[PDB]
Tab-separated table of C-alpha atoms in Angstrom:
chain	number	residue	atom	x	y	z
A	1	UNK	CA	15.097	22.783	-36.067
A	2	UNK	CA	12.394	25.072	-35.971
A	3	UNK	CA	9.033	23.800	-34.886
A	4	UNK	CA	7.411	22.593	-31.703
A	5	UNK	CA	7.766	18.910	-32.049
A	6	UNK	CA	11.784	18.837	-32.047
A	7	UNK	CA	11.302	21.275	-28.493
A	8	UNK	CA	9.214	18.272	-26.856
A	9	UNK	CA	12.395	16.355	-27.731
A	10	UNK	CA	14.627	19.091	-25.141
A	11	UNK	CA	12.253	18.527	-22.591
A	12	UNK	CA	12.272	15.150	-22.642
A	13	UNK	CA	16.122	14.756	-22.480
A	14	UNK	CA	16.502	17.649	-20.278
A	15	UNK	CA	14.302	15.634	-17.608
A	16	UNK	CA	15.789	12.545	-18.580
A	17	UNK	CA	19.173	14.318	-17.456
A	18	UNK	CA	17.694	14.616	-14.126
A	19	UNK	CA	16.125	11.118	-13.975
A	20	UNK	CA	19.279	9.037	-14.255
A	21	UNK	CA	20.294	11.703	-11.591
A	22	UNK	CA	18.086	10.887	-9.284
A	23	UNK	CA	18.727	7.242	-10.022
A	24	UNK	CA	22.587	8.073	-9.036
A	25	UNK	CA	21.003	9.381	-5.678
A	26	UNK	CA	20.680	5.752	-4.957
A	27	UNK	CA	22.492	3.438	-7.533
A	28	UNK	CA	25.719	5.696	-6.620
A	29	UNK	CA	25.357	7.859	-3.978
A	30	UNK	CA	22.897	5.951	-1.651
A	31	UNK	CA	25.100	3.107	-2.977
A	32	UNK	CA	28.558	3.860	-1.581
A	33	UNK	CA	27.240	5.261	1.604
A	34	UNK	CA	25.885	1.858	2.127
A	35	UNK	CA	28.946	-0.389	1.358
A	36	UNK	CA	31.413	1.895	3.671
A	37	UNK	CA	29.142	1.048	6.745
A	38	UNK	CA	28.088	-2.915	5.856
A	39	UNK	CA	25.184	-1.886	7.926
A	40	UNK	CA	22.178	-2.930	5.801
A	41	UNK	CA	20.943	-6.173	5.988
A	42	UNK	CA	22.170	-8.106	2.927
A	43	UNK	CA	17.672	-9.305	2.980
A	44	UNK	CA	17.523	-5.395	1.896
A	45	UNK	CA	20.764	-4.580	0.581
A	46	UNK	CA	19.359	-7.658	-1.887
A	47	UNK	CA	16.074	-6.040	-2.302
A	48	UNK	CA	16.361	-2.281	-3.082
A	49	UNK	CA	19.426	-2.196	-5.591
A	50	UNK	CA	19.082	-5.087	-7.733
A	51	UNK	CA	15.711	-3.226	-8.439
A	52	UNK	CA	17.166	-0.048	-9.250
A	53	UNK	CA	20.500	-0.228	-10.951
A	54	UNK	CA	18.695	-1.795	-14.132
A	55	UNK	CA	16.727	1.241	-14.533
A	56	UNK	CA	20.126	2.954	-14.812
A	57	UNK	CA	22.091	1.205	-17.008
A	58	UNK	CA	19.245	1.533	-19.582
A	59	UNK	CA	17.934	4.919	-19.255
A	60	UNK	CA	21.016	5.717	-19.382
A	61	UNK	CA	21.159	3.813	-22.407
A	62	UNK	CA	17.824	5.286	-23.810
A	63	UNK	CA	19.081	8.626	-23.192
A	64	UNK	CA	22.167	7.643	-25.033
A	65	UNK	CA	19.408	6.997	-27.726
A	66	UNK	CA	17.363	10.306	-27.497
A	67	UNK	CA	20.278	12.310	-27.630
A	68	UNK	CA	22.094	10.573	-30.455
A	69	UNK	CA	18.209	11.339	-32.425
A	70	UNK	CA	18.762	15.151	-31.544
A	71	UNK	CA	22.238	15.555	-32.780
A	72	UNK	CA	20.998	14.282	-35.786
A	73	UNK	CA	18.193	16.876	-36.547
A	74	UNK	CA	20.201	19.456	-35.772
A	75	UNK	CA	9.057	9.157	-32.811
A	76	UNK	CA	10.808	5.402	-33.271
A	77	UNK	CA	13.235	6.010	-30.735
A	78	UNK	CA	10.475	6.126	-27.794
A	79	UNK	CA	7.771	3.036	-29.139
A	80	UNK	CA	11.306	0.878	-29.286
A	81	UNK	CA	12.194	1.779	-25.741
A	82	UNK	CA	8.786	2.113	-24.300
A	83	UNK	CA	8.477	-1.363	-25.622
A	84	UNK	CA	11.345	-2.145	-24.098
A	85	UNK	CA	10.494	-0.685	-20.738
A	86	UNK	CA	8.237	-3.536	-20.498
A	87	UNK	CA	11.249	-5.888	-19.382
A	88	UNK	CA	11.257	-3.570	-16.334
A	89	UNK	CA	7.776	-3.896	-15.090
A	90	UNK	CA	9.099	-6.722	-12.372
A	91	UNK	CA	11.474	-4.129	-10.561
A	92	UNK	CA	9.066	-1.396	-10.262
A	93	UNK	CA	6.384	-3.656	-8.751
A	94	UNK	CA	8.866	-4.138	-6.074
A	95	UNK	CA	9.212	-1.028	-5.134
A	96	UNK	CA	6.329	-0.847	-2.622
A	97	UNK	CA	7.487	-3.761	-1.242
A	98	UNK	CA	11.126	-1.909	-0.434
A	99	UNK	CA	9.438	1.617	1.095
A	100	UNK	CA	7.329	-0.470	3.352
A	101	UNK	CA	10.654	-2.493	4.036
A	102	UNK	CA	12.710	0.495	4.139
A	103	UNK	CA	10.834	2.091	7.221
A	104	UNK	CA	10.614	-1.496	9.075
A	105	UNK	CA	14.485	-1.298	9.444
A	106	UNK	CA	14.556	2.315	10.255
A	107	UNK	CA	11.500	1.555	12.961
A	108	UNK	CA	13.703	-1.084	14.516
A	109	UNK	CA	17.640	-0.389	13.155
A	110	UNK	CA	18.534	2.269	15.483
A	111	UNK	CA	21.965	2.857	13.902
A	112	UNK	CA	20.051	2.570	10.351
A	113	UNK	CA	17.877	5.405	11.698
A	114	UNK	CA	20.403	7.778	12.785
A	115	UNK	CA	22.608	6.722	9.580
A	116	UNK	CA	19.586	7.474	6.656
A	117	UNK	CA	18.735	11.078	8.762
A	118	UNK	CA	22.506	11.681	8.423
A	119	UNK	CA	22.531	10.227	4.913
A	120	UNK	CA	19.354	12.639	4.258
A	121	UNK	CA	21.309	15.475	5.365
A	122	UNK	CA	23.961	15.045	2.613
A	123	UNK	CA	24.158	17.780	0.027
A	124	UNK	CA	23.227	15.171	-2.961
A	125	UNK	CA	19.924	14.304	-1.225
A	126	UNK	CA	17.859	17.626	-2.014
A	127	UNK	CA	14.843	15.511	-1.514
A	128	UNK	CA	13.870	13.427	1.164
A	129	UNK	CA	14.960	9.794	1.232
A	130	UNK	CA	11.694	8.017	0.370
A	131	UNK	CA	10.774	10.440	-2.560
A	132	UNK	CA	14.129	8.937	-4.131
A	133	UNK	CA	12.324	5.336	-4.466
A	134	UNK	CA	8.932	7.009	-6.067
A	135	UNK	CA	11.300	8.245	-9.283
A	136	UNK	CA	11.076	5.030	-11.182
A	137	UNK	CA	7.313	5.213	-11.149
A	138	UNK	CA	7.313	8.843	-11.933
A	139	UNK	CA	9.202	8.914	-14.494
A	140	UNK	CA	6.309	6.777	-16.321
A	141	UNK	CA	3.600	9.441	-15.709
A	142	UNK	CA	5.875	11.792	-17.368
A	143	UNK	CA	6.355	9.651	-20.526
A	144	UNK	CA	2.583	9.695	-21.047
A	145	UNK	CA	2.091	13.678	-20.144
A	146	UNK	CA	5.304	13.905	-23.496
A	147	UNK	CA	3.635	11.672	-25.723
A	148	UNK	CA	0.125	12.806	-25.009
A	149	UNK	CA	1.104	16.362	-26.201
A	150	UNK	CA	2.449	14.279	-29.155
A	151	UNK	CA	-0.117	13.166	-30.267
A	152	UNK	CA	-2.089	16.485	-30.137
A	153	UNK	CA	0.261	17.904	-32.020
A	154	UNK	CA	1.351	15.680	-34.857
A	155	UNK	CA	-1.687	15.256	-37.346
A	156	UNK	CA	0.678	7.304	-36.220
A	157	UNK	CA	3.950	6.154	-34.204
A	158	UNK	CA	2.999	8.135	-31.355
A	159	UNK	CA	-0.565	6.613	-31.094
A	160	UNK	CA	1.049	3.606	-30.027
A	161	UNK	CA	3.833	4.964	-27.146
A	162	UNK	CA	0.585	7.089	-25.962
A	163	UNK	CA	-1.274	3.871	-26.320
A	164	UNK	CA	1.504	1.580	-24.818
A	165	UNK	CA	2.549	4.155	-21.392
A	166	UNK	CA	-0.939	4.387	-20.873
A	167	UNK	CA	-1.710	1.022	-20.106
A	168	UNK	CA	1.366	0.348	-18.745
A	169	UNK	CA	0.812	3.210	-15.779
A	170	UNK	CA	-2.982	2.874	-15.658
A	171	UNK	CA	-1.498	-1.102	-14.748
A	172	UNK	CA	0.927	0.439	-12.204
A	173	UNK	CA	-1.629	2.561	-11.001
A	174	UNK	CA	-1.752	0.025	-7.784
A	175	UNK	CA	1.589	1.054	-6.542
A	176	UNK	CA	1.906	4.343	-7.549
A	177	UNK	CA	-0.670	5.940	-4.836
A	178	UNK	CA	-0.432	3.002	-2.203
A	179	UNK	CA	3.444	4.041	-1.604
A	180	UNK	CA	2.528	7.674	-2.873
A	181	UNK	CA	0.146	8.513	0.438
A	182	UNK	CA	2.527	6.388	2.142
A	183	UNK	CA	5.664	8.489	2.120
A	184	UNK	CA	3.743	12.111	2.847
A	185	UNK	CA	2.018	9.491	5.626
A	186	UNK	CA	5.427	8.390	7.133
A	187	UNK	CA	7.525	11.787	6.218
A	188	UNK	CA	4.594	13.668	8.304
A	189	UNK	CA	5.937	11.544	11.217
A	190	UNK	CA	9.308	13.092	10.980
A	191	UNK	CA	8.279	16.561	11.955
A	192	UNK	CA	5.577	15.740	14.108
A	193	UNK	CA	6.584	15.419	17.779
A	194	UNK	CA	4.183	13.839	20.472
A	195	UNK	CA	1.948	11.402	18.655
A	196	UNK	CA	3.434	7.907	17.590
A	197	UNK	CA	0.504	8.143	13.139
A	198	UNK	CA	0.679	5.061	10.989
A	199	UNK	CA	-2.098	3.348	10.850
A	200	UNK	CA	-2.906	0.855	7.949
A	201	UNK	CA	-6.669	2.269	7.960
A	202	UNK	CA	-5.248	6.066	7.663
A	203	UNK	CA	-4.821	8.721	4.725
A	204	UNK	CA	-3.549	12.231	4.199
A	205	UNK	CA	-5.851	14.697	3.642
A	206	UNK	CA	-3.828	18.241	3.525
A	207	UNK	CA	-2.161	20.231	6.124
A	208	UNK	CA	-1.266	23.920	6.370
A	209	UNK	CA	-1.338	26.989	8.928
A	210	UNK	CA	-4.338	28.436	10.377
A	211	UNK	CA	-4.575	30.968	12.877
A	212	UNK	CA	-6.279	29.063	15.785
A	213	UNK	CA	-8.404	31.696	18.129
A	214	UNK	CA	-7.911	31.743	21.984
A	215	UNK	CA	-8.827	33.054	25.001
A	216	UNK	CA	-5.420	35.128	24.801
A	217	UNK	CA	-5.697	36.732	20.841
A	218	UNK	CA	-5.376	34.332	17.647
A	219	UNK	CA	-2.259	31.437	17.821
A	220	UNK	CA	-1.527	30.101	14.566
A	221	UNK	CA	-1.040	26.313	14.829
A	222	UNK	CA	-0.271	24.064	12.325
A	223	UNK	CA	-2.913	21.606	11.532
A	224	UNK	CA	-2.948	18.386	9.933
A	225	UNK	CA	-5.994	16.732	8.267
A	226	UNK	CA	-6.178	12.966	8.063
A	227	UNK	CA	-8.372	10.340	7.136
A	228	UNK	CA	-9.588	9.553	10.640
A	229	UNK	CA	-8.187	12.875	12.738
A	230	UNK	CA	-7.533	15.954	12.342
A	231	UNK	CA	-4.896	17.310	14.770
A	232	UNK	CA	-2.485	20.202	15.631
A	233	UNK	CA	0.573	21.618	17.123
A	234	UNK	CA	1.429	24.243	19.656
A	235	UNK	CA	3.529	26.486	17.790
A	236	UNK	CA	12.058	21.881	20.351
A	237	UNK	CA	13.217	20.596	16.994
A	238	UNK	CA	9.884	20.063	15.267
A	239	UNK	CA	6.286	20.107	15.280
A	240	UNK	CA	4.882	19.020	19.305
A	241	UNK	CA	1.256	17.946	18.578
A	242	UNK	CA	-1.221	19.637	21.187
A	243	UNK	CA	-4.879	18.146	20.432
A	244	UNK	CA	-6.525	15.223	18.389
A	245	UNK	CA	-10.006	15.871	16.975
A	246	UNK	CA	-11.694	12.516	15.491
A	247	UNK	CA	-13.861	13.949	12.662
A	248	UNK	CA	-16.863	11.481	12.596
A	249	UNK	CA	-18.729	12.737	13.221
A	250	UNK	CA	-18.040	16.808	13.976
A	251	UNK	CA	-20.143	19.931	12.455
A	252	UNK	CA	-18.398	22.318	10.450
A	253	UNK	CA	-19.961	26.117	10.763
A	254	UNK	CA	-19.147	29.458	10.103
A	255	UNK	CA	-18.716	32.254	12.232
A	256	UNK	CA	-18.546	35.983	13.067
A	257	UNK	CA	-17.597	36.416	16.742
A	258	UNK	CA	-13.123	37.434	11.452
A	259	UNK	CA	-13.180	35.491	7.695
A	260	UNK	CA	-13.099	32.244	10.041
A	261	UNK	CA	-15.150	29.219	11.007
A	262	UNK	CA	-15.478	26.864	14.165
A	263	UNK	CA	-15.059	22.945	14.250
A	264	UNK	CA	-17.686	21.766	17.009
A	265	UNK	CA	-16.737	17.994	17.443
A	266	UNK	CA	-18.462	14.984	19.806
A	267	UNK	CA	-16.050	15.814	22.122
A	268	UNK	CA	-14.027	18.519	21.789
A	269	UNK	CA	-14.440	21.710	19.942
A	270	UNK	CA	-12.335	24.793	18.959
A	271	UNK	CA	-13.000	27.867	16.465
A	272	UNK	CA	-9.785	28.316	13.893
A	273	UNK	CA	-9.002	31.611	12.058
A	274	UNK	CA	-8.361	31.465	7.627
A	275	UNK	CA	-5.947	33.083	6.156
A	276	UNK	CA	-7.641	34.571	3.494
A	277	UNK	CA	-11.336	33.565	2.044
A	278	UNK	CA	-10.359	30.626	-0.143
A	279	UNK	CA	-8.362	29.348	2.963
A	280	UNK	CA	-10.777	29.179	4.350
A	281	UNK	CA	-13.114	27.436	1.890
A	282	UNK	CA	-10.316	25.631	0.938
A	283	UNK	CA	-10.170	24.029	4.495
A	284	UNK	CA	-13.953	23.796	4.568
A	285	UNK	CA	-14.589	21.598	2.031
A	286	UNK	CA	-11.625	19.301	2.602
A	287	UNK	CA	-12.308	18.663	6.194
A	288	UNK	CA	-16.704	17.786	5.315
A	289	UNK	CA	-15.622	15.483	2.819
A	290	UNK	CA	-13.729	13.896	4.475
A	291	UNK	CA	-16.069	13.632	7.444
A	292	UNK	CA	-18.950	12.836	5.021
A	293	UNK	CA	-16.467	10.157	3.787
A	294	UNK	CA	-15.648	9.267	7.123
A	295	UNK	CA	-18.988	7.302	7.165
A	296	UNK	CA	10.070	20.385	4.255
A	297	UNK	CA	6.742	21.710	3.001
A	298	UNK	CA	5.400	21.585	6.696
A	299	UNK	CA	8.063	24.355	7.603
A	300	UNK	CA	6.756	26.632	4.324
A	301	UNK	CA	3.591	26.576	4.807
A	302	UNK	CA	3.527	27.355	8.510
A	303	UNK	CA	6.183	30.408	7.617
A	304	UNK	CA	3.848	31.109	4.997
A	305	UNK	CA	0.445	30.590	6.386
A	306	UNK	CA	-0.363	28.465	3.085
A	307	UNK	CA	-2.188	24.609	3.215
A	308	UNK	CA	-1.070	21.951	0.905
A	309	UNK	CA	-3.097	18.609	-0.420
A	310	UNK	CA	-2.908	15.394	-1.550
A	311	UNK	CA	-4.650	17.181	-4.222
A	312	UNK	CA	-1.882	19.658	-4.253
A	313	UNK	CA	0.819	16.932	-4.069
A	314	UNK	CA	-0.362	14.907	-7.244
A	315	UNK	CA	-0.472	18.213	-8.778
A	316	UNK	CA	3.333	19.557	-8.855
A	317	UNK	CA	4.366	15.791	-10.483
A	318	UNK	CA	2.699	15.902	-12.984
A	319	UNK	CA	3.881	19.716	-13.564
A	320	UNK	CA	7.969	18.706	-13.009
A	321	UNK	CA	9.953	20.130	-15.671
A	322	UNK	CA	13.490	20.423	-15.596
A	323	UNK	CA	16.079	22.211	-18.356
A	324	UNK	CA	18.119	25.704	-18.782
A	325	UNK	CA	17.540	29.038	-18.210
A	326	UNK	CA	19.142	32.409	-17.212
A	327	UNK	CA	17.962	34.469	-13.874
A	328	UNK	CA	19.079	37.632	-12.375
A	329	UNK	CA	17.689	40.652	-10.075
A	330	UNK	CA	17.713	44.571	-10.812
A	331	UNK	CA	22.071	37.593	-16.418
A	332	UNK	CA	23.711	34.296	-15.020
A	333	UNK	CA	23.201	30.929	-16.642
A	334	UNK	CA	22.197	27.639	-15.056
A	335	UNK	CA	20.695	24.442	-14.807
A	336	UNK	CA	17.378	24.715	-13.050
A	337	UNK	CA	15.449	21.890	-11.759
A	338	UNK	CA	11.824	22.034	-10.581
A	339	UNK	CA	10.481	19.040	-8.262
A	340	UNK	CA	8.089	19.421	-5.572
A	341	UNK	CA	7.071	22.621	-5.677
A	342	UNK	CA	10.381	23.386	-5.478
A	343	UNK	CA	13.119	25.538	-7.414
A	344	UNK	CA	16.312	23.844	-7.608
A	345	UNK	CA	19.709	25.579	-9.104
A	346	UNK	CA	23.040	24.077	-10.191
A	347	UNK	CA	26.085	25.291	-11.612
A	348	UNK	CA	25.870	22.890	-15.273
A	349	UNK	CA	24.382	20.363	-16.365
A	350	UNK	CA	26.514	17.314	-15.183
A	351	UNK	CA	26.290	18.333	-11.658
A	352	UNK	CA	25.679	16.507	-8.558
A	353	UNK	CA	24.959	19.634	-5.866
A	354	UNK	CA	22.412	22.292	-5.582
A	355	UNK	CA	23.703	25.635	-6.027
A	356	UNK	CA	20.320	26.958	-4.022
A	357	UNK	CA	16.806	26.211	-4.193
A	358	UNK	CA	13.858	28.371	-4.145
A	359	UNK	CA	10.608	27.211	-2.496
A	360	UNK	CA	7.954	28.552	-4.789
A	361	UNK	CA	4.934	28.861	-2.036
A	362	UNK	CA	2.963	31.938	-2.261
A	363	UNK	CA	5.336	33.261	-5.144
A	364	UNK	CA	3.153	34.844	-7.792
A	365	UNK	CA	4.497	34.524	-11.748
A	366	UNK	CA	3.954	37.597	-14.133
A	367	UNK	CA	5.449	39.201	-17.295
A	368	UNK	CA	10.681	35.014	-23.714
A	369	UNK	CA	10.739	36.127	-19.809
A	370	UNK	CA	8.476	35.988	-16.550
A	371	UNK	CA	9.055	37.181	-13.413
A	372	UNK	CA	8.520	35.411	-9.929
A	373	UNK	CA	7.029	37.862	-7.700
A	374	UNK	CA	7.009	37.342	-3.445
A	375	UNK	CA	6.693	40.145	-1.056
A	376	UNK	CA	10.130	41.806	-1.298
A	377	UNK	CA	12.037	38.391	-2.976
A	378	UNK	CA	12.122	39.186	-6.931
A	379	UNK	CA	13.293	36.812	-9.526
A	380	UNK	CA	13.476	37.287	-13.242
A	381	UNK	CA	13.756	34.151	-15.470
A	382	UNK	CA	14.719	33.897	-19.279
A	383	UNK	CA	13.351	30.669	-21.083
A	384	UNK	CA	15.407	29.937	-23.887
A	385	UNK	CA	12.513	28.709	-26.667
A	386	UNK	CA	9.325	29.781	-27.559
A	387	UNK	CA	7.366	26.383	-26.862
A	388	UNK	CA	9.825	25.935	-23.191
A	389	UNK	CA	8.632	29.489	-22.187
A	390	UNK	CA	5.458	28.281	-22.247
A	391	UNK	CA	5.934	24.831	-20.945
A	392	UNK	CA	7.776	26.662	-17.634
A	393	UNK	CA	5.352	29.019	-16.921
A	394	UNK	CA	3.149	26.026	-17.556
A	395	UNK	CA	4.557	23.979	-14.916
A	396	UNK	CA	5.652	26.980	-12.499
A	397	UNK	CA	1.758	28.857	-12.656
A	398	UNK	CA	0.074	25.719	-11.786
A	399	UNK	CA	2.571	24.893	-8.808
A	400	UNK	CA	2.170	28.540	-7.290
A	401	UNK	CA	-0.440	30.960	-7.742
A	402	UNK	CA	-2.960	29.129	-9.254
């Protein structure tokens, strides 16, 4: 074909490709890792698989669908499976009910502790764990951000997958951000040492580096907006917490005894350095409203001196895009995947191992080929279409720069 509505047809089978393998992170991988040790309660052995391997064995059967529709061009197929998708609605609202269960056994199941790390430490689990039980729910944003652009482009079929998804997420909008600040609540707590942070009462504002001032020069600390508190480390293993500072109710100001501003709180109160000017009133405006309203990427951004939201989170999911391209310095082919803000590379398609993956934090995009830009780090990557050079950049400028 020739035209941009057979393209949207790539991208969706192209991150469909990486769906089902996600899906074999846990139906297959996750699977056999679980039946050579016995070790998992057969209450939650019984709880997170029999709501997952459905979701396989169709979208694997959908994408058996999609891809059958593409060798034959070179619409129906989604309102039939969309409508189908429907049948599926039980599993995914247990889903919260299995990441709340699957941190009860790892807060209690020593060896199911120091088994999942060492399961999370496999080279099949790029991601962290929990983000592996969010996919199912993802996946449905997706399916409206394809068949929105659908029906902007087409000038009748599409109204109603557009008009189907929509409800259907907007319904499964309960789940999707109770277990969604849940994971970045509970992950947090992996890399954080001297605190034991999960309160029911407790959200996740943003985090990121910020050169605290001291009596000695400046000391940048990692610090880590909540809800409730905002805290920080001290610069073992992982992050070892220093101070807490309870927002409500604390005065924001700024200051002049460097581009920074000071944090006077009821009790205690210290003055913090930006990195820049809009880290500064990035910071700002987070930390008041959530005072007013109070009435791994951790390792990136501290290397980086770069904060990341909630804001920011919601942001590079909606913008995942996976397919082909080619990349070289001053060509080689491969299968590139891009998940929280987050390059991935494999070998082909049908893999099951990241070649390498590039973490796309400060990296600026310029000029069917861009260029990834990053202090002395250069990349170059070809797009292989007209309409998927767009839709990369698309994804890839929103997730970095700006």
């Amino acid at each position: 074909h020739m035209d941009k509505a057979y393209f949207i047809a790539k991208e969706v089978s192209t991150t469909e490709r990486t769906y089902l393998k996600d899906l074999e992170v846990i139906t297959s991988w996750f699977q056999s890792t679980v039946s050579k040790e016995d070790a998992m309660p057969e209450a939650l052995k019984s709880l997170i698989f029999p709501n997952f391997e459905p979701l396989h064995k169709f979208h694997t059967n959908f994408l058996k669908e999609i891809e059958q529709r593409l060798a034959l061009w070179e619409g129906d197929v989604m309102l039939k499976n969309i409508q189908g998708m429907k049948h599926l609605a039980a599993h995914l609202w247990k889903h919260s009910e299995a990441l709340e269960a699957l941190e009860n056994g790892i807060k209690s199941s020593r060896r199911l502790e120091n088994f999942c790390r060492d399961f999370e430490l496999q080279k099949v689990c790029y991601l962290p764990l929990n983000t592996f039980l969010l996919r199912p729910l993802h996946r449905l944003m997706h399916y409206k951000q394809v068949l929105e652009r659908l029906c902007k482009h087409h000038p009748r079929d599409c109204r109603a997958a557009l008009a189907e998804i929509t409800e259907m997420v907007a319904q499964l909008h309960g789940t999707m951000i109770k277990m969604e600040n849940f994971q970045k609540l509970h992950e947090l707590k992996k890399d954080l040492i001297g605190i034991d942070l999960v309160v029911p009462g407790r959200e996740f504002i943003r985090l990121g580096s910020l050169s605290k001032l001291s009596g000695k020069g400046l000391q940048q600390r990692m610090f880590f907006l909540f809800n409730d508190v905002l805290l920080y480390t001290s610069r073992s293993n992982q992050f070892k917490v220093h101070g807490q500072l309870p927002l409500y109710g604390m005065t924001i100001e700024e200051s002049e005894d460097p581009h920074c501003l000071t944090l006077r709180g009821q009790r205690q109160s210290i003055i913090v350095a930006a990195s820049s000017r809009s880290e500064m009133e990035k910071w700002v405006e987070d930390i008041q409203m959530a005072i007013d309203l109070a009435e791994t990427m951790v390792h990136v951004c501290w290397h980086r001196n770069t904060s990341v939201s909630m804001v920011d989170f919601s942001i590079a999911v909606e913008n995942q895009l996976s397919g082909n391209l080619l990349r070289k310095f001053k060509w080689q082919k491969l299968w590139v995947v891009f998940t929280n803000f987050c390059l991935f590379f494999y070998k082909s398609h049908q893999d099951n191992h990241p070649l390498a993956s590039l973490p796309l934090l400060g990296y600026s995009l310029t000029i069917y080929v861009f260029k990834l830009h990053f202090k002395s780090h250069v990349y170059y990557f070809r797009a292989e279409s007209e309409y998927t050079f767009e839709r990369w950049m698309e994804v890839i400028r929103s997730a970095t720069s700006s």
